[PDB]
Amino acid sequence: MEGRLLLLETPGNTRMSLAYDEAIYRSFQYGDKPILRFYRHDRSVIIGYFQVAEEEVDLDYMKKNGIMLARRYTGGGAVYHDLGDLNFSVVRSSDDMDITSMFRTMNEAVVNSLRILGLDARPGELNDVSIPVNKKTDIMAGEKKIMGAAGAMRKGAKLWHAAMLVHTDLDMLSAVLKSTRERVANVTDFVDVSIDEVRNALIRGFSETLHIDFREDTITEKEESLARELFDKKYSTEEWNMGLL
Ligand SMILES: [Mg+2]
């Protein structure tokens, strides 16, 4: 019931930030304390494991706008991130490989968190990794998407991470990702709250819903070392971020 709250970031370096996520996930052993990490990325596009940068984005556009390209460990589509997005990941012990159940539980936690702030949200309804919005992995505010998520599972553990639009440049978001703009929204379009307020609400929602007492802690030397190794050998390389490795 005791958990770890990691306010671990690497703003400026999205590839390293993603390395941290895989690091805490891979280093995790069944029975360890659950982990909830909050972080943010500066202007960048993150593509899913099974995607190739040149099919989903305009490398020319992003290069001209100084938008970092990064590829994550988890599957799913491409998303745009900026400092207006609040990202968070959860790592816990797992007894099965039920993907649908993991997303359903996390979304329940998210809905409860947003309810605290007076924002009524709900999970998307379709099982189609290819569509932009309304997926069961998305969180909607009416007909607008305000949060997306992805995950991975292995024997003994599971990773779930999301990116919620708090005050992100929705235009830029639509323009970098190859109507659409009319299908997404920021939490601040509904409630005037800061990133920390959203963070604290999520801490409460997850703690209450999962029944975990997430207490502020720090990354271990073991996890940090693994993250640096993953960055050095993979996340920092071009073959990886392009989808060739
Ligand atoms: Mg999603």
Curated annotation (Swiss-Prot):
One of its GO terms (cellular component) is cytoplasm. GO terms for biological process: protein lipoylation. It is an enzyme of class 6 (ligase). The gene is lplA. Belongs to the LplA family. GO terms for molecular function: ATP binding; lipoate-protein ligase activity; lipoic acid binding; metal ion binding. This is Lipoate-protein ligase A subunit 1. It is found in: Cytoplasm. InterPro entries: aa-tRNA-synth_II/BPL/LPL, BPL_LPL_catalytic, Octanoyltrans_LipM/LipL. Pathway: Protein modification; protein lipoylation via exogenous pathway; protein N(6)-(lipoyl)lysine from lipoate: step 1/2; Protein modification; protein lipoylation via exogenous pathway; protein N(6)-(lipoyl)lysine from lipoate: step 2/2. ATP binds at residues 72, 77, 80, 85, 132, 135, 145, 149, 163. (R)-lipoate binds at residue 145. Part of a lipoate-protein ligase complex that catalyzes both the ATP-dependent activation of exogenously supplied lipoate to lipoyl-AMP and the transfer of the activated lipoyl onto the lipoyl domains of lipoate-dependent enzymes. Can also use octanoate as substrate. The keyword Cytoplasm applies. Mg(2+) binds at residues 137-138, 149. Its EC number is 6.3.1.20. Its main location: cytoplasm.
